[PDB]
Design a protein around this ligand. Structure first.
Ligand SMILES: CCCCS(=O)(=O)Nc1ccc2n[nH]c(C)c2c1
Ligand SMILES: CCCCS(=O)(=O)Nc1ccc2n[nH]c(C)c2c1
Ligand code: NA
Ligand code: NA
Lengths: 414, 414
C-alpha cells in the first residue's frame, strides 16, 4: 500500500504561507505575537453589540481590515470572502517569489464556511426596491460559495482545478487535504490552498451562542477562550484568513524554493453522530488522525506535536481528548491556538495548518492561553505559560467541524 | 501509472440511483418520459412571475414537490436542500436493498450550489422582530452548506467521510468524482454521492437572467431549451435532485448487488478565464475529459456517447463543441438532457450522471428536444427526433459550471 515514506506518494512540501488574523496582517508578526503571549480577543466596540445587547460581547476582529485594501471597484464586484481571497492570494504569490508555474499543473482549493452570503440580502433588498432589473449582473459570481476560490484561481491562473470544500470548522483543513490529494494523484504539481471566512457580526453571534457554544466572559476578553481548562464556557470568534503554497519537492527544487515543512498525509472521516455535537466517543475523529498517519507512513509514536482543534467548548475539548488518545498520540505536546486567535470557522483549519508548519520550522510551540486549572478528565500535555522549544519532527493538525467532519493533516519538518 | 483498466484502481460500479425531476419523482418514470419525448418545462404558474413581471416565465418545478413528503417537524428543523437530501437518501437506500455496510467504510459526498440560504433570511427576520434570542438553536445546522450531506450521512450512518463540494453547475458531478477518489484511494468501499439544489423562485431568475443566460421563449415553454440549436437563447430552470450509490465491484458482489454501470474515472480542471463565461477555446474543459480517460484507461476512440453539459447558452454550447473536439470525442453520440429537464445547477451534474448510467444500461439515448436547425459552426452527432438505440460501451458526462469548473466522469457499461 502506497504512502509518503515508501515512495508511493510524491513528496509534497510547503513553500509559502500567508494569513491575516486578529493579531496582525503579517503571518510572521502573528507568529511573534503568539510566542509573546499576545491575544487578538478584545471587547467588541461595534454598535451591534449594544444594539441587540448580545450575550457575547468579545471577539477578535482582523487587526488590519480587509476592506482597507479595497477600492471602490473591488467593493461592489466582490463579496467579502472574495475580497479576502484576492488579498491573501496576492500576498501569497509575492511571498513565494512570484513563480511562473505551468497553469495546467496549478490547482486551487479554498474552503469557506458559508460563501458570499451578505450579497444574497443585498440582492434581496435591491429587488424589493427597484424590481428584478435592479439586481446586478455580477450577483451570481459574488453569491456562489465557490466564488473565493474562483477569484484566486482566476487571479493566479490555476487551470488544474479550482475546488471549494465546505465542512464548517474543517473547511480550511479539508481544502489542504484535497489539494494534497490533487497532487499525489498526478492532477497537479503546485497548489494554493487554505480557507477564507466572513467577519464577526450580530446574527453569526446570535446563531452560535444560542447553541450555548460561545463564551460569555465579557469582563476579561483575553481570558475567555480557555481550551482544555476547567473554567471554559465555549469558543470565541476570531476573524482570520489563511493560504499556503504546496508543491512537489521536485517542483520546489527546480525553482529554488526553500520549503518550510512537508505535507505528509491527510485523513477525512465523519462521525455520523449529531448535527453539531461531536461524538463524545472520539473514535472517528481519532481515525482521521490514524488515517493521516497511514498515508504519511508514520506511527503514533512519531507524532511529537498536536495542533488541537480546541474550541474550548466543554463537549468538544473532551471529545478531542478521547480522539487524541484513541489515535495513540496522547504523549504529544498539544497546542490550542484558538486560545489566542479564536475561531474563524471555514478559515481556522487553514490558519492552524500554517501555525503547525511554523511550529515545525522553528521548533517551538506557543503557549495555550488561559490554561491555568487543567480539567481533571482531560489529561494532555498542553503547552502553557511560555513557548516550549522542542525537537518536533512530525506534527498533526486537527479540525473537527460542526456536522461531524473530521480532518487531520500530518506535517513533518523539512 | 495506475488506471482502472490496468488494475491500479479498484473497479467501482454503480448499484443504485435515485432522482426527483420536473418529469417524475421516480427515476425510471423520468427515464421513460425522456424516451417518449416528454418535457418538464412548462409555464410558471407561481405568483412571483406576475408580481415582478419577470423576463423569464418558464421553468420546470419538481413533478412531486419535496415538502409534500415533509411533516411539521421536518419543515422547521431542516432547510430545503436538507429535506430533499433526506428524502432522496431514504429512497436510494431502499432501492439498494437497504444494505448493511461497514459505517467506517461508508462515505457521503453531496454537492450543492448554495446551501440552506433561505434560512439565512428567516433568521435575519426573526432577529429583527424578537431580537437575538428569537433565532433558533438549529439555525447553524440548517444554514451551513454542508448541511444536506451531513443530514444524509447522519441518516445513513456514513463514517468514512461526509463532503460537500461547491462548484455551481459541476457540484453534482464533482461530488461523484470525489466519492470515486475516496474509494480508489482506500478511504472507503461504498459511497452515496450526488447533488441537491433549491427550487425556482424570483431572485434566482433575476440574478441569472440579468447575465442574459436564460431563455425568454415564454410563448412555447417546451421549445425554449434548445441545446446546440441555432435559435437558442439561454438555459431554462428545471428543478432536480439526484443521488447514486457507488461501491467497489468486490463490495457489490459480496452483497448480491446487480450493478447498473461502471464508474471508471474522473477529471477536474479549471479554465481560469472568466467568472461566469466559459473559455470559448475549450482546452481545459476538454482536458477534463482527457483526464477522465487517462484514469479510466481508455482512448477517445472508445467513447461512444457524450452526455453534454449543453445549457443552450450561445457561448456555452460553442465552448463545449470545441471541448469535445479538443478531447477527440467528436464522433460520439451527443445528448443534452437539459433540453427536456432544464438546469438544476448544483444537482444537474448528478442527475445527468444517472441518465448516463441509464443510457449505458439500456443501450439507448433519449432525443435532444428542440434540436431542429443545427447551428452551422456546431457540427456534432446530436441525437434527436427519436431515441437512438446503439452499442454504447463507454460514455462521458460533462459538467462546466460557472466559475470555470470542469468535471468529466467516465462511465462504462457493466
Ligand atoms: C469569525 C467570524 C465568522 C462569521 S460566519 O461564520 O457567520 N461567516 C460569514 C460568512 C459570510 C459573511 N458575510 N457577512 C458576514 C457577517 C459573514 C459571516
Ligand atoms: C433550479 C432552481 C435553482 C435555484 S438556485 O440556483 O438559486 N438554488 C437555491 C438554493 C437554495 C434556495 N433556497 N430557496 C431558494 C429559492 C433556493 C435556491
Ligand atoms: Na488545530
Ligand atoms: Na451532461
Amino acid at each position: 500500500q502506497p504512502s509518503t515514506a515508501n515512495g508511493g506518494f510524491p513528496s509534497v512540501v510547503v513553500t509559502a504561507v500567508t494569513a491575516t488574523t486578529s493579531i496582525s496582517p503579517d503571518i510572521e508578526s502573528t507568529w511573534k505575537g503568539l510566542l509573546a503571549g499576545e491575544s487578538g480577543i478584545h471587547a467588541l466596540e461595534d454598535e451591534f453589540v449594544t444594539k441587540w445587547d448580545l450575550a457575547v460581547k468579545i471577539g477578535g476582529h482582523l487587526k488590519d481590515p480587509v476592506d482597507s485594501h479595497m477600492g471602490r471597484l473591488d467593493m461592489r464586484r466582490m463579496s467579502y470572502v472574495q475580497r479576502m481571497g484576492k488579498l491573501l492570494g496576492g500576498q501569497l504569490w509575492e511571498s513565494a517569489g512570484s513563480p511562473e508555474v505551468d497553469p495546467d499543473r496549478f490547482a486551487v482549493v479554498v474552503g469557506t464556511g458559508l460563501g458570499g452570503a451578505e450579497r444574497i440580502v443585498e440582492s434581496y433588498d435591491l429587488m424589493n426596491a427597484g424590481g428584478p432589473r435592479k439586481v446586478s449582473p455580477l450577483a451570481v459570481q459574488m453569491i456562489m460559495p465557490n466564488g473565493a476560490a474562483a477569484v484566486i484561481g482566476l487571479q493566479l491562473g490555476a487551470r488544474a482545478g479550482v475546488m471549494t470544500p465546505v465542512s464548517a470548522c474543517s473547511s480550511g483543513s479539508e481544502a489542504i487535504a484535497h489539494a494534497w490529494r490533487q497532487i499525489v494523484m498526478g492532477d497537479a504539481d503546485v497548489a494554493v490552498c487554505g480557507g477564507v471566512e466572513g467577519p464577526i457580526e450580530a446574527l453569526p453571534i446570535a446563531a452560535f451562542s444560542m447553541m450555548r457554544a460561545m463564551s460569555t466572559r465579557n469582563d476579561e476578553p483575553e481570558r475567555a477562550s480557555r481550551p482544555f481548562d476547567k473554567d471554559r464556557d465555549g469558543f470565541v470568534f476570531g476573524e482570520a484568513g489563511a493560504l499556503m503554497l504546496i508543491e512537489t519537492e521536485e517542483h520546489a527544487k527546480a525553482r529554488g524554493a526553500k520549503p518550510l515543512a512537508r505535507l505528509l498525509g491527510a485523513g477525512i472521516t465523519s462521525d455520523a453522530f449529531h448535527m453539531v455535537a461531536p461524538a463524545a466517543d472520539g473514535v472517528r475523529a481519532g481515525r482521521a488522525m490514524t488515517r493521516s498517519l497511514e498515508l504519511a507512513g508514520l506511527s503514533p509514536a512519531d507524532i511529537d506535536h498536536v495542533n488541537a482543534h480546541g474550541t474550548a467548548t466543554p463537549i468538544g475539548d473532551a471529545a478531542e481528548a478521547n480522539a487524541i488518545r484513541v489515535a495513540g498520540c496522547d504523549q504529544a505536546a498539544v497546542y490550542a491556538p484558538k486560545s489566542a486567535l479564536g475561531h474563524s470557522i471555514g478559515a481556522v483549519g487553514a490558519l492552524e495548518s500554517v501555525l503547525t508548519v511554523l511550529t515545525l520550522r522553528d521548533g517551538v510551540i506557543p503557549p495555550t492561553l488561559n490554561y491555568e486549572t487543567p480539567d481533571p478528565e482531560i489529561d494532555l500535555d498542553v503547552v502553557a505559560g511560555e513557548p516550549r522549544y522542542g525537537d518536533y519532527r512530525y506534527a498533526v493538525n486537527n479540525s473537527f467541524g460542526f456536522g461531524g467532519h473530521n480532518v487531520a493533516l500530518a506535517f513533518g519538518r523539512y
